[PDB]
């Protein structure tokens, strides 16, 4: 029959996180077969970057604390997992770290790069004092999903690293009117990321994945 | 001479959990997010009994 | 397919000399090199023996036909 | 739980969405179903060929 | 664990069963025979209706 | 899976795995860094002493300390010693009873204790471990007065 | 204190599949449990 | 990187009016993603013909019983929703039952035009007991998927979707790499207007044109 190709881009940007899109007025139907289903691939597979190898110069093994901080070691990598990091023309870089004295390590400590940006200034990862300072290496890559440490000289510390930059999407159907039809409907998304990918990128590159599992069908 | 060992075991289907009410039970399947039931606002749950 | 352990046991309906019965055959469909007169569908010798017996193709008298012949 | 799903289907309503209509065949019943314009347990007569 | 094992494996269990036993066997029904697929994990998969 | 990328109910276990040297009536055991018929990739995570180091990831079938007893009349079968010529590997005559972990359990070398006898002989990673010790007690003083 | 966070009275909402995307045709009990971990993991389980 | 390519396994011919596909190679969670977009637009965007009207002569309600025909109007108006249509020239045309039989009434005794086709060419829509006529009016028209006769003179349910019954169940693909990789298995039942595999490769280009301008 008749079908009214949705061409276009709405994107509401209220902050770097919880950006809601609208597409454009789809067809009589189209509302659920076409959200839910952007919706399951935006949670599955969304190219990101995380750290999945840090080595510190002090440290044996993830286990045993270092003097001078307060956060143990285990701690210290759990808070690398929080970082939103953005490679721009590279696949694996490797960032350092090295501070001293009394003050509060957090993500705007790490050297800057020109391929490298750091959403996220305010993340704290450790806490110094006046006995001691830490000094470490970080390594990050491209990734897909979740990948463990078993799936993937003696200080090196692999981290599971989980290459999604979504956290949560929603998704709802009004109604549209341009005019030409009189049943016709509005897809609106709620995407929310970390602030790493862009979110009207992020549709263009869902609808390459879905397009491609169809042109081989 | 001893020596020690850290292992740290993830969870895994098969492994038993329960609460505090003398409600046991051993996981089953991990389901990826996307297949798990969520309220309007998107929000998935974490455990189905 | 073809997988039906209820008919080749409805014709006997002894379910103990179809063991017995299906034991002779599955050796020589095993050891011997003889062809089974079914069609090998990927399956085990085990299981192609029991499709014989449901199909009415071996018989008690036809197993020790067909043995006798290579002794 | 496999009793639970077979109760719940087979469990006649008075008044629900899609009452009342006929249906030529199992297969209409389900193509019904499938759009959400009938509801799971709901009075209707389908022809059936048994 | 060399990759070609795994298909040699998949072929030894096709048609050949393997027997289950609870530890309070207190009747016949306590031993039944399966036939076996490969799963990922650690525990063996039941069916729900026996 | 949400409850396993942000590690939930992730849990440590230490477990403990202790060799002992005693003394057999044809020699004594002594922990030593030589194993008869293995390779370098068996003896690269040991150290001088004959010890794993701490914080070395160990695999299923490691070695984690080296241990070898003497043995007298093996009675080697002539078949055996044919084929010991084609390599060309030489007869020793030690057991190999080394200290490995079992099968299906890995994990991270994090802390190795060393107990000898009043007046034996030490090792080199006795002494290694002792400095350690004598140096967390004296930073401890200073940060007293 | 269900009311004070906007929250329904009844402790029940209704959820959507995951899956198939459909709203399921009856409210659901929702809420957060404290789940606890036992010592009876699979690893000293399985045998062969 | 970037996922797999599915290629087909076996499509299943058991019956001309029913197939059952199977996609093997697959991604873990791709198994529900396209089998339930490919399942939601065979039954509901899928354009068709059927019958949306019945006028028969004599006739007040769905109730009332008529002479001359050993069956009731609702057993006239389920067969008549069984009917197979497919016009072609234009989009809403009225068709005229005329026929005074006595042993059978097939559906292909109904007067076709230049531009309508039935398919169905041995449907019994009634038998002729007595000796009395049966003149009824038929109307087709076009439509999207399955309109009940609730919304929008005897109004009749309209299934324009072709498939009949559309289900898929996905199940674990064992593979040497990775064994969480399912398949999807779709099968299908069309009416007969077209072939049960290529109402699989209508519906799957109607999903492409709209995400199209997007694509890159």
């Known amino acids: 029959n008749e079908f009214l190709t949705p061409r276009h881009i709405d994107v509401q940007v209220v902050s770097q996180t919880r950006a809601k899109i609208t597409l454009e007025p789809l067809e009589r139907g189209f509302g659920h077969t076409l959200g839910n289903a952007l919706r399951r691939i935006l949670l599955s597979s969304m190219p990101g970057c995380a750290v999945v190898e840090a080595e510190i110069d002090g440290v044996l093994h993830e286990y045993s604390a270092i003097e001078g901080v307060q956060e143990d070691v285990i701690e210290i990598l759990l808070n690398l997992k929080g970082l939103a990091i953005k490679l721009h023309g590279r696949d694996e870089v490797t960032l350092t770290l090295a501070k001293k004295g009394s003050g509060v390590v957090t993500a705007a400590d790490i050297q800057l790069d020109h391929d490298v940006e750091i959403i996220n200034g305010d993340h704290v990862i450790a806490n110094l004092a006046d006995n001691g300072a830490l000094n470490m290496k970080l390594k990050v890559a491209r990734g897909r999903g979740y990948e463990p440490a078993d799936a993937r000289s003696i200080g090196r510390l692999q981290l599971d690293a989980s290459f999604s930059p979504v956290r949560r999407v929603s998704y709802v159907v009004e109604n549209a009117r341009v005019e030409q039809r009189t049943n016709l409907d509005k897809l609106v998304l709620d995407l929310e990321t970390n602030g790493t990918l862009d979110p009207e990128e992020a549709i263009r590159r869902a609808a390459t994945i879905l397009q491609q599992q169809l042109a081989a069908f | ?49 | 397919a073809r997988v039906t352990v209820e008919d080749c046991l409805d014709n006997v309906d002894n379910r103990f000399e179809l063991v017995m019965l299906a034991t002779k055959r599955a050796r020589q469909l095993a050891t011997g090199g003889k062809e089974p007169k079914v069609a090998w569908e990927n399956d085990k010798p085990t299981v192609v023996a029991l499709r014989e017996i449901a199909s009415g193709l071996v018989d008690e008298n036809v197993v020790q036909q067909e043995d006798i012949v290579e002794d | 739980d496999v009793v639970m799903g077979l109760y719940y289907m087979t469990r006649e309503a008075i008044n629900a969405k899609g009452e009342g209509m006929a249906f030529a065949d199992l297969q209409e019943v389900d193509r019904a179903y499938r759009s959400g314009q009938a509801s799971l347990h709901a009075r209707v007569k389908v022809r059936i060929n048994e | 664990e060399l990759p070609e094992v795994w298909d040699v494996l998949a072929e030894v269990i096709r048609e050949h069963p393997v027997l289950l036993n609870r530890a309070p066997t207190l009747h016949r029904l306590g031993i039944q025979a399966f036939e076996p697929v490969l799963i990922e994990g650690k525990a063996i998969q039941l069916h729900p209706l026996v | 899976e949400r409850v396993v990328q942000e590690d939930r109910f992730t849990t440590i276990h230490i477990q403990e795995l202790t060799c002992v040297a005693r003394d057999t009536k044809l020699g004594p055991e002594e922990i030593t860094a030589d194993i008869p018929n293995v390779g370098e990739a068996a003896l690269n995570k040991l150290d001088e002493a004959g010890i794993v180091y701490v914080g070395a990831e160990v695999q299923a079938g490691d070695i984690l300390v080296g241990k070898v007893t003497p043995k007298g009349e093996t009675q080697l079968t002539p078949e055996e010693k044919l084929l010991r010529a084609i390599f060309g590997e030489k007869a020793s005559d030690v057991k190999d009873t080394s200290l490995r972990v079992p099968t299906g359990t890995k994990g991270t070398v994090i802390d190795v204790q060393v107990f000898t006898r009043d007046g034996v002989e030490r090792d080199s990673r006795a002494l290694s471990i002792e400095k350690m010790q004598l140096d967390q007690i004296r930073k401890d003083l200073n940060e007293e007065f | ?48």
Do not use: C, W
């Open chain 7, 1 to 48: 204190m269900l009311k004070l966070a906007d929250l329904p009275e009844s402790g029940q909402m209704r959820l959507f599949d995951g899956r198939t995307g459909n709203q399921f045709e009856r409210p659901t009990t929702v809420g957060y449990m404290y789940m606890l971990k036992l010592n009876h993991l699979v690893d000293d389980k399985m045998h062969a």
């Open chain 2, 1 to 49: 001479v001893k020596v020690y060992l850290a292992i740290k075991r993830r969870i895994q289907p098969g492994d038993k959990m329960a609460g505090r009410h003398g409600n046991k039970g051993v996981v089953s399947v991990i389901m990826p997010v996307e297949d798990m039931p969520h309220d309007a606002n998107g929000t998935p749950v974490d455990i189905v009994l």
